[PDB]
Amino acid sequence: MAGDTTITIVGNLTADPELRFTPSGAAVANFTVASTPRIYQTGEWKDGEALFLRCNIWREAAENVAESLTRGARVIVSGRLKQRSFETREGEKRTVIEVEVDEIGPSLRYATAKVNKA
Amino acid sequence: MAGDTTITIVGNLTADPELRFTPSGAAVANFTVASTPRIYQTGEWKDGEALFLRCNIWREAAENVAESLTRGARVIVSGRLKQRSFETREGEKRTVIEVEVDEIGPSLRYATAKVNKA
Amino acid sequence: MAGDTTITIVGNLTADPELRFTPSGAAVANFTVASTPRIRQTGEWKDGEALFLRCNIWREAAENVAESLTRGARVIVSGRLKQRSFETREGEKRTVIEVEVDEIGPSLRYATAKVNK
Amino acid sequence: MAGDTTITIVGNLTADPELRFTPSGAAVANFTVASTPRIRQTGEWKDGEALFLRCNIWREAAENVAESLTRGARVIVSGRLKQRSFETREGEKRTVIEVEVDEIGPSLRYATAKVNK
Numbered sequence: 001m002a003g004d005t006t007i008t009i010v011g012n013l014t015a016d017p018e019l020r021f022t023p024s025g026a027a028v029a030n031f032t033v034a035s036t037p038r039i040y041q042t043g044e045w046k047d048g049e050a051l052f053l054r055c056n057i058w059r060e061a062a063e064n065v066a067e068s069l070t071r072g073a074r075v076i077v078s079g080r081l082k083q084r085s086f087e088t089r090e091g092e093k094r095t096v097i098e099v100e101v102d103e104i105g106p107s108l109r110y111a112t113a114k115v116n117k118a
Numbered sequence: 119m120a121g122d123t124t125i126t127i128v129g130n131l132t133a134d135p136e137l138r139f140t141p142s143g144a145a146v147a148n149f150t151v152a153s154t155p156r157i158y159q160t161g162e163w164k165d166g167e168a169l170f171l172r173c174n175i176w177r178e179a180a181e182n183v184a185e186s187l188t189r190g191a192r193v194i195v196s197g198r199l200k201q202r203s204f205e206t207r208e209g210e211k212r213t214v215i216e217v218e219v220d221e222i223g224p225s226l227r228y229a230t231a232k233v234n235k236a
Numbered sequence: 237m238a239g240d241t242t243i244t245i246v247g248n249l250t251a252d253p254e255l256r257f258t259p260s261g262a263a264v265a266n267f268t269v270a271s272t273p274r275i276r277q278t279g280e281w282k283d284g285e286a287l288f289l290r291c292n293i294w295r296e297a298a299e300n301v302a303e304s305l306t307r308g309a310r311v312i313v314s315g316r317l318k319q320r321s322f323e324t325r326e327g328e329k330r331t332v333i334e335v336e337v338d339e340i341g342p343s344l345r346y347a348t349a350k351v352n353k
Numbered sequence: 354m355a356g357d358t359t360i361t362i363v364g365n366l367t368a369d370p371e372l373r374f375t376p377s378g379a380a381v382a383n384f385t386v387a388s389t390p391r392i393r394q395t396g397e398w399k400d401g402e403a404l405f406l407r408c409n410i411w412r413e414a415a416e417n418v419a420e421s422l423t424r425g426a427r428v429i430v431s432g433r434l435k436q437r438s439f440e441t442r443e444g445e446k447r448t449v450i451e452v453e454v455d456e457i458g459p460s461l462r463y464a465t466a467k468v469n470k
Binding site: 126128178179182183185186187188191193194196221222223224225226227228229230231232233234235236 | 244246296297300301303304305306308309310311312314338339340341342343344345346347348349350351352353
């Protein structure tokens with residue numbers, strides 16, 4: 001089976017993708033996708049509950065992300081959910097759900113892109 | 119558009135679905151779905167990083183859940199992700215991602231069910 | 237990073253599942269799910285165009301399915317999409333898109349069910 | 354709770370997008386995405402059966418798409434599935450499953466792109 005739990009999110013980047021490198025020399029980009037849904041007999045529609053999702057994406061992919069996308073860029077993200085743990089100074093278990101990004105791209109819904117393949 | 123961020127999860131219930139009722143008299147069931155993925159040239163496959171996901175489901179749906187599913191039942195869940203906030207005694211912002219369940223069912227992958235419609 | 241195109245579908249079975257057996261022993265169920273969305277000032281939300289999808293499930297699940305489910309039953313399905321290239325009486329090719337079902341269950345949205353392992 | 358059956362698809366465009374215009378003013382792009390999975394002791398993982406899906410996108414996105422993308426380009430797509438009932442030269446009906454695209458972008462898995470709003 002390999003029931004990796006998959007998700008697709010659409011939204012905007014809270015800020016420029018943070019790019020870092022591990023002990024092992026490997027690349028990583030961190031960024032948070034903020035999704036805003038919408039809901040309808042209210043006259044017009046309305047906005048909705050904003051959802052911030054932290055995103056991790058590794059290696060060559062990550063450099064591409066870093067040098068293509070800015071604060072506020074609207075993107076579309078396919079990936080897997082991961083549960084990270086860590087502790088407070090006082091030893092409290094904290095957990096966050098994060099996204100392991102498999103594919104990501106800018107969204108031509110409201111814009112145009114120039115594709116540089118390889 | 120109405121970009122509500124959707125997800126499908128498969129896994130087991132950590133324990134019997136907790137059923138409660140609001141001020142307003144409304145029903146709610148709480149339960150946590152634990153997903154276990156798998157990953158392959160290791161000889162055989164292997165298990166993987168377990169993912170606990172807390173789940174909320176409201177109203178008539180909720181009673182149905184409550185009186186159909188037990189600790190450990192393997193289920194399949196379609197729904198939307200929500201970001202809840204709350205604070206520690208000391209005023210720390212804590213956030214959890216939870217699931218608003220739209221459809222759920224037992225999984226005939228390993229079992230049989232008796233359907234009682236209405 | 238593999239890439240079978242996954243899908244989740246919710247709807248009603250059109251008919252009692254069709255459970256066959258290969259000479260080579262193994263079990264096979266087939267069926268079809270009608271996803272009827274309830275997605276213009278007239279009320280709140282009224283049916284609109286159903287979608288029908290041939291599903292293929294195999295092995296022990298298939299038995300379990302056939303045994304449990306029933307024309308009309310409401311189900312949730314997680315599968316992958318597959319093209320299978322058909323061949324008509326007249327000829328041509330006539331390719332069609334179908335669903336390798338990974339998991340399936342009856343929806344407790346409008347129903348109870350008792351379970352059996 | 355609506356219920357258009359949503360899908361996400363990743364693959365390569367088979368051809369330069371086809372951008373038309375309705376007499377009634379409006380824009381329409383059409384194209385087709387080849388989802389090629391890379392999902393038996395021989396290595397690690399080798400191509401295997403592609404899946405091809407006719408996509409329909411509309412309005413301003415369509416312009417934006419046509420303008421930005423290119424035969425061969427790798428894309429991510431979020432859409433809903435629709436049956437549209439066809440009609441062949443010989444007759445019959447010949448129904449086919451397609452994709453109302455909601456969002457689409459080029460994948461930065463193997464590429465850079467500069468963006469323009």
